[PDB]
Write a protein that binds this DNA or RNA. Structure first.
Length: 85
DNA sequence: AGGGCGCCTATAAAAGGGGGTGGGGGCGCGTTCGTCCTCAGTCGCGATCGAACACTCGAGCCGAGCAGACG
């Protein structure tokens, strides 16, 4: 860590074979992919509103632009359309 | 024991029935040939349904442009 080194011994190590997947990874540009993209952004926006101390709760746009910098700001504008002014 | 007698022999002919033997015919008859015939297997559909592929449309997401207000 930042403060120093720490040492443990280990005695047990597992080898994991070939995985049998139980969850389907979406494809690129899929409907499930884009749904997750906007849902994740919406959850981050709600949790930034919960963390806000001023009443009424207020956030800044460039916090979201620091978190999601590949997003066009139009997508963020629409996620803020419903729930913020 | 031996002379005379009986017999078989060759010869003709008839008469009639009986018996023996060989051949032919009958007939039935047994053997051989013809004919039916159905089941089993193959295949050929072709009946049916299920699965795949193609097409259309609807919805969702992203980007861009315009409007409004602050600086």
């Amino acid at each position: 860590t930042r403060q120093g080194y720490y040492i443990r011994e280990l005695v047990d190590i597992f080898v994991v074979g070939q995985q049998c997947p139980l969850f389907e990874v979406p494809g690129p540009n899929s409907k499930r992919a884009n749904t997750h993209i906007r849902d994740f952004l919406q959850v981050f926006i709600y949790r930034l509103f919960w963390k806000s101390k001023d009443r009424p709760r207020r956030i800044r746009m460039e916090d979201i632009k620091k978190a999601f910098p590949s997003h066009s700001e139009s997508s963020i504008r629409k996620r803020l359309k419903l729930c913020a002014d």
